[PDB]
């Protein structure tokens, strides 16, 4: 049996660590809610 615990507030924080790229990927979503890369 699953349970929940508070982990914090939802707020935007200035000066947060800015990382990560922005790729344009061709995808397909199946009936089971799974993505797949189409090439």
């Amino acid at each position: 049996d699953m349970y929940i615990e508070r982990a914090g507030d939802i707020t935007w924080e200035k000066d947060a660590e800015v990382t990560g790229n922005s790729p344009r990927l061709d995808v397909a979503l199946d009936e089971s809610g799974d993505f797949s890369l189409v090439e």
Binding site: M2, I4, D9, I10, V18, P23, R24, L25, F35
Partner: protein
């Protein structure tokens, strides 16, 4: 039990010790998370019980106590913040510029940040702190890393 707005960890004692299976958002008396986290099972909050209200395996979303409340959207131009809540690790805002998942039914926002599967359900925020979607459903790119979509539900 606890119904204060904010971000929450989804845990389980079914396995060895206490294992985090995902994350969720509590907003307007409704708990929002990814379907693959709970599989639609009921949740506990102290003495209180949260029962599923709506869910869909294709959208990979599920709400507890009431209908889906989150309706903010990525504008296509601005940076967003992933409020990553990692297993055993403290909550942390990670700013990034999202990419695009090009699909047969339209384009979707996508965050290219690799986090453990147990981080599934972590909210993605706009410059106002609004929940524009959840992290946890995407694809494995040529580099082995995960690129999750910005999964938003519908507010009826």
């Amino acid at each position: 039990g606890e119904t204060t707005d904010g971000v929450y960890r989804v845990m389980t004692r079914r396995l060895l010790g206490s294992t985090q299976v995902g994350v969720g958002v509590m907003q307007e008396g409704v708990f929002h998370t990814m379907w693959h986290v709970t599989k639609g099972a009921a949740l506990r909050s102290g003495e209180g019980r949260l029962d599923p209200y709506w869910g869909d395996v294709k959208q990979d979303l599920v709400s507890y106590c009431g209908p889906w409340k989150l309706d903010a959207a990525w504008d296509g131009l601005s940076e967003v913040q992933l409020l990553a809540v990692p297993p055993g690790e403290r909550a942390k805002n990670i700013q990034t510029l999202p990419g695009i998942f090009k699909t047969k039914d339209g384009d979707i926002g996508a965050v290219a940040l690799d986090y453990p599967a147990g981080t599934s359900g972590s909210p993605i925020l706009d410059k106002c702190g609004r929940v524009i979607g959840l992290y946890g459903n995407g694809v494995v790119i040529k580099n082995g890393s995960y690129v999750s979509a910005i999964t938003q539900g519908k507010r009826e």
